[PDB]
Amino acid sequence: QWRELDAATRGEGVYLWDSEGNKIIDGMAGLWCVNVGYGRKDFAEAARRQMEELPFYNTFFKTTHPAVVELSSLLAEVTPAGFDRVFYTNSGSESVDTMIRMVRRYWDVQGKPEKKTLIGRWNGYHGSTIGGASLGGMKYMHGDLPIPGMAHIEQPWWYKHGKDMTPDEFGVVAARWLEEKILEIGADKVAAFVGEPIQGAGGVIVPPATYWPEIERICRKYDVLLVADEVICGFGRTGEWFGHQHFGFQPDLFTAAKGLSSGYLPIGAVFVGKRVAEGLIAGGDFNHGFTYSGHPVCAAVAHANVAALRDEGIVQRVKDDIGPYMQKRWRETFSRFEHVDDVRGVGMVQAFTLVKNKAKRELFPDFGEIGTLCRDIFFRNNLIMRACGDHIVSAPPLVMTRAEVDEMLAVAERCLEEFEQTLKARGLA
Amino acid sequence: RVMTRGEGVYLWDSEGNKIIDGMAGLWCVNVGYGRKDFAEAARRQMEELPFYNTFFKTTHPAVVELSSLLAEVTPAGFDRVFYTNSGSESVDTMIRMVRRYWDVQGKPEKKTLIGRWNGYHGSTIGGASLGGMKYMHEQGDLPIPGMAHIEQPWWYKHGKDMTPDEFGVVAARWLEEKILEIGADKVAAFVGEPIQGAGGVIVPPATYWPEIERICRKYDVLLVADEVICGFGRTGEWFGHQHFGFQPDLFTAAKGLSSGYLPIGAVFVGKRVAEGLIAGGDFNHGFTYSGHPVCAAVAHANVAALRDEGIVQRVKDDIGPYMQKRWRETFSRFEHVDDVRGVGMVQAFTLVKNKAKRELFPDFGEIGTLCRDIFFRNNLIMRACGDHIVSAPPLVMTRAEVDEMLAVAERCLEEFEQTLKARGLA
């Protein structure tokens, strides 16, 4: 009946439940976002409390809503220095859209109305808004997109574009693709470069260690703003509070998604560095949001989420305990298989790639076909892992226990033992 | 001044001063404040299942339940809804659907959407482009391609010697002339708020929309209503386009769907367009898996209340007519107030330099801020859109509360007139 109306039961910890009684291991944590796992009844209480006390705070008053002030203050403590001014929204997509406007408007204030082009990457994802889909580098997205002033460079995907280079060597090369694009367009027309510290929807593409430092060198060289999209890597996913902290680059601003509330309520934000912030304040355009922005109820729940991620040592636990454990076990489990390679990951994000031949580094034809097939197995065994093309990705709730990790891998191991079984059964060597 | 509480149509500050909210948050708090039963709906849903995954072949029940409910309050033909987080996202999504739709029909050149100057459709790059705010077209480098604009049906300004009913036909035909200037083969849709809200509650003549609709059909152009404000009982009908009597192919909604208690939005897709998108496959995912359970649960409670408690029906039959009658009885006498207008529970008027010449004050907006500051000093929230003064209080407002709000409002304008003459601006 539910399927019928749709076409026209529970969650707790890292587990989900169906009406058939079967438990389900959610290795995706909703949409990369449910970082503290499900069943957080103190979040529900924080939401109720706020929706019964003050669910609104109107412009009429000089001040701003307490819960927002309280959230802004807590976030300042967990975010790196120079990000006191935050701009709240309802989603990561809206975050990206907003920062696209802030980026262009900033240069206007700086008396450089030519600097409007943002450079993204192919296979990069930055939301579903028109501007967001334009900044992204997905094909099946490209509403007459992209909009003007949007350019793209190739992604740091060593396995495919690495040739005979070492990852670190390929990191420099891949990063200098940006320099090439900048000189092609003209630095005076380039406003910013935007990238996920790790490409999420693109199949968890982890760039070499040399990549981001080189991207930053180039940005600073040509006076191009550096923007990180923490949509997925945000809030402990890599072990650090933010992806750009792990890879060691400092963006002028960055975008966050509902991971900020572990997906319990819709919310997002753009964190604006001092340099850019003073530019926007000098303009006066986004001053209304730096003050009045943020839905009270969502702020309250988001506050409790952040407070929990820090106070309960969930984030620190990813960097010290469960992260290193997940990476070692992930690599121990998937390195045996004949059609699995490029096993990768950091903190609580992992992935690998289904391949025809590991020796040749030969990918399967019709990139995506074999991935979906492997996904179907995962879904028959009540294990949720996502297939981005022929990439299998993982991103469970950060509070997952070592025991729960082994359990998940145990199931995943079966699925692949079967995957290669079906593979050879269909004649796909 | 610190806000402590909200109850019904009032806001209370830290000192105990009562504040009449004549704007209902942002045109959205329709059932009023102090709704503790919604808090329960949210609480319950968030403890049980505050999310849903695409592993199953099902859609979260709370969402299905909401969809099923909305289908009963929306006109026939609107069975499929695409949920979002805000009115802005709805507009942006609607833009992508409209264009994707014509791609399915083999008409890839049919991509230009037409809006109106002084129109408002969110704050996203696409929404701002479709909107007609000039102070908003420069920032962000707007508008984006495939976006055009026609003049607004503002009679007081562009009415000349025509009667409103005649002006309504002329204003509507601006759409046709634009379509022909661009070429019908390039026009994907026309988009408009049934009543321009942020523009200053611009109520078009009764002849406007019916003519707009005829033109859209004539040139095979999609018609899109933006119910960001008129939605959910504002005009007395569940949706503005119902009041003015036109059937859009899709319409967008904002957090009024949950009375602003939680961020939520939706795109309502008619038969024609829905069937089209399904043939594509681009959006088929969101017609089922889109929507946040908690927000959906609070929306369900809001919509259920709006209907089951006769709140909307009451606007149409009781407080609406009363509000309009009283609104006009109150402001008609003032020398520098004209174009007293409104319907249901959205009203407005315009501060003018001289009613005779229909002359407006210079620097449209300077005088609106002056008058607005008076409302605020007296703990009354009514918005100023230029020299336009607008009002859209909670639909559950009682008659006595209407009289109270109008009493203070009249007091503020008596002052306005005096400070106008004192400053030699009469």
Chain A touched by B377 (CB under 8 Å): no
Out of B19, B29, B144, name the one closest to residue A60 (CB). Answer: B19
What is the bridge-based pairing of β-strands B265-269 and B250-253?
antiparallel
Angle at CA of residue B242, ends B238 and B243, nearest 5°: 95
Distances from the Cα of B295 to the Cαs of A391, B43, B258, in angstroms?
Answer: 33, 11, 8
Q: How far away is chain A from the Cα of B353, in angstroms, using its nearest Cα?
A: 27
The number of C-beta contacts closer than 8 angstroms across A and B is 192
What six digits make up the tokens of B222?
């999609």
Residue with tokens 């959910």: B232
The secondary structure of B261-299 as a DSSP string is SS--EEEEE-HHHHHHHHTT-SSTTHHHH-S-HHHHHHH
Spell out the residues 6+ positions from residue A320 whose beta carbon is closer than 8 angstroms to its own: A239
Residues of chain B numbered 60-79 and touching chain A (CB < 8 Å): 61, 64, 67-68, 79
Distance CA B420, CA B306 (A): 42
Distance CA A329, CA A401 (A): 13
Distance CA B142, CA B128 (A): 7
Amino acid at B115: G
B276-279 own/partner pairs: CB under 8 Å, 24+ apart: B276/B101, B276/B104, B276/B105, B277/B97, B277/B100, B277/B101, B277/B104, B279/B104
Chain A touched by B331 (CB under 8 Å): no
Let me know: does A256 contact A271? Beta carbons within 8 Å. Answer: yes
Same domain, B125 and B248: yes
Same domain, A327 and A386: yes
Chain A touched by B39 (CB under 8 Å): yes
Same domain, A355 and A259: no
Can you name the residues that pair with A117 across neighbouring β-strands? A190
- Which chain A residues have a beta carbon less than 8 Å from that of B29? 56
SS3 of residue A363 by DSSP: strand
User: What is the per-residue burial (b if ≥16 Cβ within 10 Å, else e) of A261-271?
Assistant: bbbbbbbbbbb
Is A92 annotated in a binding site? The answer is yes
Can you name the residues that pair with B346 across neighbouring β-strands? B343
What is the domain range of residue A98? Answer: 40-312
Query: What φ, ψ does residue A396 adopt, rounded to 5°?
Result: -75, 165
Out of B48, B126, B282, name the one closest to residue A10 (CB). Answer: B48
Find the farthest-apart pair of alpha carbons in chain A and give their distance in angstroms, rounded: 71
Q: How far away is chain B from the Cα of A250, in angstroms, using its nearest Cα?
A: 24
Let me know: does B100 contact B335? Beta carbons within 8 Å. Answer: no
Same domain, A120 and A192: yes
Query: What φ, ψ does residue A355 adopt, rounded to 5°?
Result: -135, 150
Angle (deg, nearest 10), helices B87-104 and B271-278: 70
Is A72 annotated in a binding site? The answer is no
Same domain, B296 and B174: yes
Q: How far away is chain A from the Cα of B206, in angstroms, using its nearest Cα?
A: 34
Let me know: does A291 contact A247? Beta carbons within 8 Å. Answer: no
The last residue of one of the domains, among A290, A312, A334, is A312
Let me know: does A194 contact A126? Beta carbons within 8 Å. Answer: yes
Distance CA A423, CA A263 (A): 37
The last residue of one of the domains, among B309, B338, B359, is B309
Out of B11, B48, B111, name the one closest to residue A144 (CB). Answer: B111
A60–B263 CB contact, under 8 Å: no
Chain A touched by B126 (CB under 8 Å): yes
Same domain, B223 and B322: no
Chain B touched by A11 (CB under 8 Å): yes
Nearest one of B220, B307, B241, B252 to B30, comparing CA atoms: B307
Spell out the residues 6+ positions from residue A302 whose beta carbon is closer than 8 angstroms to its own: A71, A260, A261, A265, A267
SS3 of residue A356 by DSSP: strand
Residue with tokens 């097939």: A373
Estimate the share of chain B in helix, then strand, then coil, as percent rounded to the nearest 5. Answer: 45, 20, 40
Spell out the residues 6+ positions from residue A1 whose beta carbon is closer than 8 angstroms to its own: none
Report the residue count for chain B: 426
How many helices and strands in chain B, by DSSP H and E? 16, 16
Angle at CA of residue B132, ends B131 and B134, nearest 5°: 125
Let me know: does B345 contact B27? Beta carbons within 8 Å. Answer: no
Alpha helix positions (H), A312-401:
314-320, 322-334, 369-380
Distance CA B194, CA B384 (A): 19
Same domain, B156 and B230: yes
Q: B205: how many CB neighbours lie within 10 A of its CB?
A: 22
Q: How far away is chain B from the Cα of A235, in angstroms, using its nearest Cα?
A: 19
Out of B43, B64, B68, name the one closest to residue A47 (CB). Answer: B43
What six digits make up the tokens of A396?
């469970």
Same domain, B18 and B77: no
Angle (deg, nearest 10), helices A296-311 and A66-78: 30
Nearest one of A243, A248, A241 to A305, comparing CA atoms: A241
Chain B touched by A266 (CB under 8 Å): yes
- Which chain B residues have a beta carbon less than 8 Å from that of A8? 79
Same domain, A10 and A72: no
Q: A403: buried, middle or exposed (CB in 10 Å: 19+, 13-18, 0-12)?
A: exposed
Angle (deg, nearest 10), helices B61-73 and B293-308: 30
Q: A307: how many CB neighbours lie within 10 A of its CB?
A: 15
CATH number of the domain within which A378 lies? 3.90.1150.10
What six digits make up the tokens of B380?
């009354």
SS3 of residue A271 by DSSP: strand
Q: A223: how many CB neighbours lie within 10 A of its CB?
A: 15
Alpha helix positions (H), B49-161:
61-73, 87-104, 125-130, 155-158
Is A93 annotated in a binding site? The answer is yes
Q: B305: how many CB neighbours lie within 10 A of its CB?
A: 19
Chain B touched by A48 (CB under 8 Å): yes
SS3 of residue A220 by DSSP: helix
What six digits make up the tokens of B114?
């037409």
Angle (deg, nearest 10), helices B293-308 and B36-48: 150
Out of B39, B50, B85, name the one closest to residue A48 (CB). Answer: B39
Angle at CA of residue B149, ends B146 and B154, nearest 5°: 165
Same domain, A183 and A249: yes
Distance CA A67, CA A297 (A): 8
Question: Domain total for chain A?
Answer: 2
Chain A touched by B15 (CB under 8 Å): no
Q: How far away is chain B from the Cα of A129, in angstroms, using its nearest Cα?
A: 6
What six digits make up the tokens of A289?
């949001």
Same domain, B281 and B338: no
The last residue of one of the domains, among B309, B343, B358, is B309
Angle at CA of residue B126, ends A84 and B269, nearest 5°: 120
CATH number of the domain within which B104 lies? 3.40.640.10
Spell out the residues 6+ positions from residue B139 whose beta carbon is closer than 8 angstroms to its own: A101, A104, A105, A108, A285
Distance CA B145, CA B166 (A): 33
Distance CA A184, CA B313 (A): 62
Q: How far away is chain B from the Cα of A22, in angstroms, using its nearest Cα?
A: 12
Chain B touched by A130 (CB under 8 Å): yes
SS3 of residue A245 by DSSP: helix
Distances from the Cα of A344 to the Cαs of A234, A335, A405, A417, in angstroms?
Answer: 19, 10, 16, 19
Distance CA B258, CA A279 (A): 36
Q: B56: how many CB neighbours lie within 10 A of its CB?
A: 18
Spell out the residues 6+ positions from residue B162 whose beta carbon is closer than 8 angstroms to its own: B155, B170
Same domain, A278 and A361: no
For residue A124, the Cα-to-chain-centroid distance in whole angstroms is: 10
Distance CA B309, CA B194 (A): 25
Q: How far away is chain B from the Cα of A222, in angstroms, using its nearest Cα?
A: 21
Distance CA B162, CA B168 (A): 9
A63–B2 CB contact, under 8 Å: yes
Out of B13, B39, B89, name the one closest to residue A94 (CB). Answer: B89
Let me know: does A126 contact A147? Beta carbons within 8 Å. Answer: no
Three-class HEC string of A152-199? EECCCCHHHHCCCCCHHHHHHHHHHHHHHHHHHHCHHHEEEEEECCCE
A61–B2 CB contact, under 8 Å: yes
Experimental approach was X-ray
- Which chain B residues have a beta carbon less than 8 Å from that of A6? 58-59, 64, 67, 288
SS3 of residue B116 by DSSP: strand
B19–A105 CB contact, under 8 Å: no
- Which chain A residues have a beta carbon less than 8 Å from that of B274? none
Residues of chain B numbered 230-249 and touching chain A (CB < 8 Å): none
